[PDB]
Design a protein around this ligand. Structure first.
Ligand SMILES: O=P(O)(O)O[C@@H]1[C@@H](OP(=O)(O)OP(=O)(O)O)[C@H](OP(=O)(O)O)[C@@H](OP(=O)(O)O)[C@@H](O)[C@H]1OP(=O)(O)O
Length: 155
């Protein structure tokens, strides 16, 4: 067809950094326009064959840091997996990079919020951006994780 279709909840976060929910084949022509080097994938489920073939054909590296898709109020975001994903984001060699989960609201929102903390954003600005994507599914647990996340080791 004649039009591009960004994936669910697509946004540019920064120079060379994007966020979304799970891309499907209708989104591949749009993703090709970004010249991605990397995908940071935050779900534990195996990457579907369709997505794997797109990744391979397009020369994109897959980084998988599987965070269990927990529902409130029993959400347990591993600090370690967010820290390893931030290390990938902070290396310009991996850019352009797309961060995605299933809908790009919770696991993706936490990783982006922790990056904003490293960029010295005030918490209210971090939460406002998180809530723009999470909307009616904004979780206190996601924001509490960002509130407590320690930026000592990086900064
Ligand atoms: O287990 P997940 O976290 O991978 O999936 C949850 C979705 O979480 P999701 O997988 O989207 O998380 P992320 O990809 O991290 O946003 C969430 O979707 P949403 O809250 O809209 O993001 C949805 O909400 P619904 O569509 O309103 O019924 C449900 O909470 C759903 O939990 P499940 O129904 O037990 O699989």
């Amino acid at each position: 067809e004649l039009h591009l279709i960004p994936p669910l909840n697509f946004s540019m976060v920064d120079n060379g950094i994007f966020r979304s929910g799970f891309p499907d084949s209708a989104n591949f022509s749009f993703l090709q326009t970004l010249g991605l080097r990397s995908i940071i994938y935050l779900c534990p489920e195996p990457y579907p064959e369709s997505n794997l073939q797109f990744l391979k054909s397009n020369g994109i590296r897959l980084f998988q840091f599987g965070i269990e898709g927990n529902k409130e109020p029993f959400v347990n975001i591993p600090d370690h997996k967010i820290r390893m994903a931030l290390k990938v984001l902070l290396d310009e060699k991996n850019h352009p990079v797309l961060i995605h989960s299933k809908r790009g609201k919770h696991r993706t929102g936490c990783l982006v919020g922790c990056l904003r903390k490293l960029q010295k954003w005030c918490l209210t600005s971090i939460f406002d951006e998180y809530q723009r994507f999470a909307a009616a599914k904004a979780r206190v647990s996601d924001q509490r994780f960002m509130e407590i996340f320690d930026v000592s080791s990086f900064s």
